[PDB]
Ligand SMILES: CC(C)(C)NC(=O)N[C@H](C(=O)N1C[C@H]2[C@@H]([C@H]1C(=O)N[C@@H](C[C@@H]1CCNC1=O)C(=O)c1nc3ccccc3s1)C2(C)C)C(C)(C)C
């Protein structure tokens with residue numbers, strides 16, 4: 001038993017990080033088969049970052065302007081092209097450590113592991129969720145652009161995030177591996193703001209089930225409710241509305257604990273209207289929304 | 302910016318994990334050079350686990366009673382010996398993915414990463430601290446014994462923890478890689494209890510500095526206290542006393558923020574006496590004590 005913010009093992013991804021330099025600008029790249037993927041703002045000088053015309057900046061580069069280092073080994077760039085906000089560098093050597101992989105675009109509310117890298121070197125791993133406002137609450141310093149987010153299913157690494165930038169509230173924005181941003185953001189240093197965030201209700205319910213599995217039961221009550229009555233109080237507190245698809249996904253957790261989803265919902269409603277009163281759930285004094293139902297099953301079953 | 306519970310990248314350890322089976326009993330082992338280390342209770346049956354005489358149980362085994370699997374490959378056991386609560390299995394092949402490593406015994410308050418494994422296969426990675434009562438608040442299911450805890454310093458993996466068992470309060474206990482338990486525990490199924498846990502004061506102050514670095518400043522004030530005055534109120538709240546050694550370790554954080562340690566102690570004193578009053582610090586509504594000063598610098602400076 002117990003419950004932790006658990007990331008996927010990072011070994012398969014660690015062997016794919018390289019360092020990419022163009023001029024005096026350096027960041028991380030992802031090396032798969034014979035292609036290196038990285039954020040396109042590697043081709044920009046500090047001056048260009050204010051309002052770059054990336055097409056112009058790229059036509060003024062040649063293959064030799066890109067230094068790609070995999071540890072000590074230099075990789076020779078033989079082609080380049082830009083796809084949306086990523087650059088793809090064709091290199092002369094295919095990565096012998098390329099894992100089975102795919103590129104996925106995730107939805108708000110889902111979680112993934114981030115391998116934070118600097119100078120092409122893995123520094124740390126942590127778990128986060130895609131927020132409803134398409135930011136992530138990450139931990140990134142200068143030089144972290146190009147770090148990736150991923151999940152592992154069976155033997156296959158699913159890449160879902162490449163890091164680009166930080167917003168002025170301390171949250172982070174990036175793209176999928178096709179170069180398309182999550183959210184209404186652009187990779188230029190102009191005024192932008194994330195929309196208001198909301199709490200991921202289905203995740204909160206999944207975490208309450210993890211609590212019951214682990215013996216924290218003080219918040220349960222003998223009541224039940226309906227979706228419509230629950231969704232009405234949820235919106236009053238900036239919670240995502242619950243749908244029948246959500247109820248179905250919580251099925252296995254309902255089954256293992258014998259507590260129906262709508263009874264769990266009555267407990268949540270009561271916690272929303274009256275707070276915790278200095279009590280904790282799984283060591284937290286706030287309601288946690290960055291564990292999905294699948295995360296709970298994986299860790300508790 | 303930002304601040305997360307960050308683990309070390311686990312790749313160097315993943316290649317050392319193997320599955321060890323003796324009879325119907327299977328758990329994880331750690332394969333370094335030509336030695337596999339694993340918890341000695343793999344030699345037990347559901348029956349032996351209440352009052353095992355491990356010396357008796359081990360003399361009744363031979364090398365071929367041990368099946369060691371490294372993925373698709375069988376490793377052949379050519380010798381075995383017990384070192385305290387670990388078993389050391391000599392095998393015929395040296396692990397080609399052996400990293401530069403050392404074995405370290407850590408102190409309470411220090412943190413490390415855990416690679417949770419099942420059937421020799423890595424399942425997840427997370428960070429925890431060794432509590433003052435020598436337990437860890439981990440996440441472990443049946444079959445997780447032999448999972449390891451580690452830190453990475455430059456190129457070198459420092460192994461500090463092998464998982465063995467769960468206590469009835471839902472916390473976890475294990476050994477260093479020399480087989481010596483952390484705490485007063487033994488690997489038999491008899492009544493044992495963890496001592497009372499205390500909060501790691503030096504880590505709470507380190508986390509308060511992380512907050513200031515990230516722009517959370519609401520709890521600060523102009524007051525100052527003395528070490529003895531601070532330590533007076535610390536005891537009342539089950540906090541570890543603070544020593545000048547701790548004050549010294551917080552030096553680089555104090556310098557980078559311009560807030561003296563004794564100033565921040567005065568802020569902590571106030572938070573203990575009045576609570577947060579529905580405010581949060583770095584997204585938590587409780588005082589967090591599982592980040593060391595070193596963890597904060599690594600994550601907030603580089
Ligand atoms: C637009 C809006 C006002 C909302 N925000 C910003 O202007 N934020 C800016 C931003 O993040 N930028 C600026 C520049 C990069 C992107 C950027 O510096 N990435 C960072 C990761 C950042 C840093 C803090 N933690 C992170 O996540 C990064 O890794 C890099 N830096 C540079 C700079 C020069 C050369 C190469 C690189 S590689 C972009 C092309 C967008 C900062 C935080 C620097 C002010």
Ligand SMILES: CC(C)(C)NC(=O)N[C@H](C(=O)N1C[C@H]2[C@@H]([C@H]1C(=O)N[C@@H](C[C@@H]1CCNC1=O)C(=O)c1nc3ccccc3s1)C2(C)C)C(C)(C)C
Pocket residue numbers: 001325326327328342343345346347350441442443444445446465466467468469473487488489490491492493494
């Ligand atoms: C002594 C005290 C009363 C304070 N507590 C316990 O009796 N706790 C017991 C305990 O943990 N034991 C029993 C047995 C193992 C050790 C043990 O089962 N390890 C677990 C890891 C556990 C499980 C839950 N999460 C973990 O961490 C484990 O991986 C293994 N299981 C077995 C069983 C049979 C054969 C091989 C193995 S490999 C020991 C030799 C001590 C439990 C939780 C099973 C009741």
